[PDB]
Amino acid sequence: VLPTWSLDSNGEMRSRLSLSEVLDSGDLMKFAVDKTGCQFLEKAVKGSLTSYQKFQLFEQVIGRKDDFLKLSTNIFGNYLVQSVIGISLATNDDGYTKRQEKLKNFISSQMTDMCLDKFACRVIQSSLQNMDLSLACKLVQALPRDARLIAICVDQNANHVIQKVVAVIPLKNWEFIVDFVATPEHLRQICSDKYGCRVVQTIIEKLTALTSAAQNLRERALQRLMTSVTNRCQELATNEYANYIIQHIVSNDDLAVYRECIIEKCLMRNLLSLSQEKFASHVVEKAFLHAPLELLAEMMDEIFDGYIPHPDTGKDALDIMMFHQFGNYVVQCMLTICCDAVSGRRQTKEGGYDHAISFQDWLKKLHSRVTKERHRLSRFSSGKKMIETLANLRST
């Protein structure tokens, strides 16, 4: 692949080559797609470069559209493209304007194709981070607004472009992404994706973390996304990937109003069923761990006295969860909460009133059930941990 003039007598690339010899040869495209040749160019562009050496790099790497795309989509050449882009942004000569303008036109015309490429998406991410904000926003304007935005959110490579936009681009320029994902036909299919749920979570985290107009923009975008999530949180909480979205909302104190809505309208009256779900049981745990004490008392009361026992065996909701493959983790969560509160590791005061007696009452009911079923529980690692948890508390 390498040109013959650059090879030694054995056929390998000549050691100690000058960067100027590669630039003046017209064979840079061969070096940039070769593992050894591109490692050479990567180190060369790290040192000091003359004025014309920079111009030669600008023209041969990011100056011609077809060569720029070929290197951006190459396993090796994409590193050189990012380096030359960085050098181009750090060189404030007279040609600075026309260079970034041509770079913008190259990326914008092939935005989606580069986003979905394993290597070209790195060029886009490094561009968004380092370019002029005015030029980086024009890359954002090249993102598709139609159904092709689904492909970008759920793609293994392109999803990292969206998350980079969320991190460094002002919300005004990517509010259309919030509107798109919040649409009912798009929320469940993106939140339930392995990579799309990372996009949604990153959007929520950014909208949670200037002017009153900027705050109004941030609040209305978060409100729209939260409304869509709460409207489908039952399907999202039981989902393999979307359950992380519900957990993050319940676990975030800055989203308190939405946590109580999820607890009030989705988890209440369904605690026994959701505790036996592979994915929703993690959501029930987070709800127990972060619910306000008034709602936490209603969750406790539902497990203890909210279900009619089995007319034959007499086992209630606590019995079913305690011996379920997933429900047992919810019971362990309730016990740990009560033991932490009694021993002074969890908050029991709200409104200037100490609710420690409520945690003592729930602890008594949990402790009495573990005692009643200690024979069976001592054969399970989950039962052993409940027994050990109560043993530590009675040591004190």
Binding site: S273, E277, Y307, I308, F323, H324, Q325
Partner: peptide, 15 residues
């Protein structure tokens, strides 16, 4: 540990 989900009839808060 059980793998199948078991349901019990819900009881309203005011009942």
């Amino acid at each position: 540990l059980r793998s199948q989900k078991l349901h019990l009839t819900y009881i309203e808060k005011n009942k």
